[PDB]
Amino acid sequence: VQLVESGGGLVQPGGSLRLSCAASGFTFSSYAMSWVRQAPGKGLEWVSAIIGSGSNTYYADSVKGRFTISRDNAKNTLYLQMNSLRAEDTAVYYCAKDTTPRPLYSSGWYGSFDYWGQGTPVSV
Amino acid sequence: TGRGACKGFYSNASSDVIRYNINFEENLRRGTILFKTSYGAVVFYCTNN
């Protein structure tokens, strides 16, 4: 169980960036996953989530149509794509991970998480 | 991590089996063995009483 990311720092407003996350040391295929960000001095706003297979992909409405999240289970990675960035996205990303082992051929309730990344600061 | 000084070739890889070599006809009648779990502590011991 080890979670790291890639592609942090600073981005110009309204740009584009290929944010990344990688995971290792656990049964990846059977667990769901999510994006959450800790903007300075406020809450852990929920960016997105992906169910184990990858067919079901969800967003909030500050997140809908602006970003593209994707899983690649064969090399154990979590891609993320930025479009139409605002100043309010200045935060730090932990790619979080679900505790419930759903089969690869199923889909359903995510929501309980046990491990997070290291925290990638992104400002824009 | 915690292993004595490895002599010869060695690696930091995550092993899967730990082995203990014991003397000729020797027996651990005189001690216990301690494990750790993600859900508590476990210990192995043997007695007739």
């Binding site: 959450v36 800790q38 809450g43 852990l44 706003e45 929920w46 989530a49 969800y58 909030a60 932990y94 505790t99 309730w109 995510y110 929501g111 309980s112 998480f113 046990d114 997070w116 990344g117 290291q118 925290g119 | 993600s38 859900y39």
Partner: protein, 106 residues
């Protein structure tokens, strides 16, 4: 589905039986959990499904609740407790992180 959390902030001596509550504006009925967030570091689940704690948590933490009202308390405070307690329900896939509560030493 929106959360409220109290007390928003608090400073207490090291050893007090601190108590914290969450609200969900709907009858969640069990689906709520709490986390410990170290400022400047990573969070960590404390208790889930209201009443039942994760295997890597001492029984010094506890909490319960059913309906809209929920709680998460500690039997005693310890010097490593300078962090932020968060809660979050999983009744709706559109989820809502909680209002957040902070604890300080005195």
């Amino acid at each position: 589905i929106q959360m409220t959390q109290s007390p928003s902030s608090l400073s207490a001596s090291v050893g007090d039986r601190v108590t914290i509550t969450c609200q969900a504006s709907q009858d969640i009925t069990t689906y709520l959990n709490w986390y410990q967030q170290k400022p400047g570091k990573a969070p960590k689940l404390l208790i889930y499904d209201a009443s039942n704690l994760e295997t890597g948590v001492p029984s010094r933490f506890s909490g319960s609740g059913s309906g809209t009202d929920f709680t998460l308390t500690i039997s005693s405070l310890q010097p490593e407790d300078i962090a932020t307690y968060y809660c979050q329900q999983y009744d709706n896939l559109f989820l809502t992180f909680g209002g957040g509560t902070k604890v300080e030493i005195k």
